[PDB]
Design a protein around this ligand. Sequence first.
Ligand SMILES: Nc1ncnc2c1ncn2[C@@H]1O[C@H](CSCC[C@H](N)C(=O)O)[C@@H](O)[C@H]1O
Ligand code: NA
Lengths: 265, 265
Amino acid sequence: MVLYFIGMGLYDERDITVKGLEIAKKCDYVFAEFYTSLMAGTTLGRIQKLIGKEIRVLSREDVELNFENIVLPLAKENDVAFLTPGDPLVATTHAELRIRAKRAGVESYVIHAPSIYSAVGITGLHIYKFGKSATVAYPEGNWFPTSYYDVIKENAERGLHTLLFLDIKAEKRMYMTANEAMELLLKVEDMKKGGVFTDDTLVVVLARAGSLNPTIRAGYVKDLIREDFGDPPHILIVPGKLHIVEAEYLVEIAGAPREILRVNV
Amino acid sequence: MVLYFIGMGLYDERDITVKGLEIAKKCDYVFAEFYTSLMAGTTLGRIQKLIGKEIRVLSREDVELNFENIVLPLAKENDVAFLTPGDPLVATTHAELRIRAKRAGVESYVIHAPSIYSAVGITGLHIYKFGKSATVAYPEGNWFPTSYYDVIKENAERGLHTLLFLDIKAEKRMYMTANEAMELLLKVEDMKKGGVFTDDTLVVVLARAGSLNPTIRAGYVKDLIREDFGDPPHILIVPGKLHIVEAEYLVEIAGAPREILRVNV
Ligand SMILES: Nc1ncnc2c1ncn2[C@@H]1O[C@H](CSCC[C@H](N)C(=O)O)[C@@H](O)[C@H]1O
Ligand code: NA
């Protein structure tokens, strides 16, 4: 009787750690969700094939309202695994599920996997220089989210980089592109006018991290806002003050304008 | 003609991803470094047996000063793998290595793995609330660095959490414990008296992340400063003001005192 929170990683079924795979293979029941992120390089079939078990996919409602009714009951008499994209506890509310497990007398263990949060390292930006992170959320009806704009501003004043997770509506199959995130940010800039995000702002786009050929691009909003970065998932990053080697990397690897090599100390 | 930056993960040889293991097995030559960090839950022998290849260890100088003379030459006519603890390119200087590859006409791909940057999510603290990160260094001689103290201050001031890496002497295999980190910070507080780190400061300790039995403890400095958190590596976190949900996880999972439910929320 035990519950394992196992991350499947960034892009495909092979992004799971060996630890996670060997443990999953031996579990009596295997559950999973695919609404907290998008694994663009795999399918349930390949995952099931790899694990050798039938996987039951849970919806956000199943998890958020019925985890203790669907999963925990089985964990009391068996070994259960709950799979999620990337790392199970990063930018999700799955951590709270460990409390529910506890209160049900079920021991839980966490098996990490590569996460988008650390994969930003591939952009060449020093990961220790990232500040507070935020999520660019799709406006809905008359409600237009904007706090993420304030995060960029706060980080920028401190010279820190800003990681922007992009919205996702799995059931509607909606995956926010970096382009849409940029459009929303310009609209918020027009609203607040803090000179935080404009056509001249340098940004970095990372798409489908985890694949052998992710899309890594850096440049000014005016030039990237309409560029095709390939299929989702995408994340947008607004760098703060750059170190020379960061700029060098963005130019050499992410095709940024050579002019950014000239940093303003 | 191809260099593969492959992450070994957090704690033991099984923290590498299935993708990383399979690719490593197809490489003609396999290099690894254990100076940016160490896999306390395994050995070079166990990693070699898992990969089924002989692994050549590289020192910090081998990499920083001679990467292009030791690794790249072979990558020109073979498939080569460069293994590192955690997720590749997280270590500040590693991304630049890809520029060296490009310059040498060598293709490079990144195979991600679990990083402490995302693994700390197991402490229950929301990942988006983490601010700038820092490393607590041992003072020595006339040198007493304290910038990490200022990082905590700026972060906590904005309600952000601070991830603190503890000093490590790879070659000498000596790790700074969370206990030593706390003592050091109290000492720094005594000199700067900014009211940033005191006996009443709430801290979180994460030890052996990646292991199936990690140590996750949360409490006030006065009660944790002499507690035994087990074997290294240790990571110290100074949380900013907590979301009730974070506080609850810390109490139920990290054994934190109920007092934080009213004092630090
Ligand atoms: N492989 C990938 N490439 C680019 N962005 C990704 C990504 N995986 C996740 N994301 C980003 O993060 C959002 C999901 S947030 C959940 C993250 C997950 N627990 C993890 O550990 O990665 C997506 O909407 C997207 O903006
Ligand atoms: Na961070």
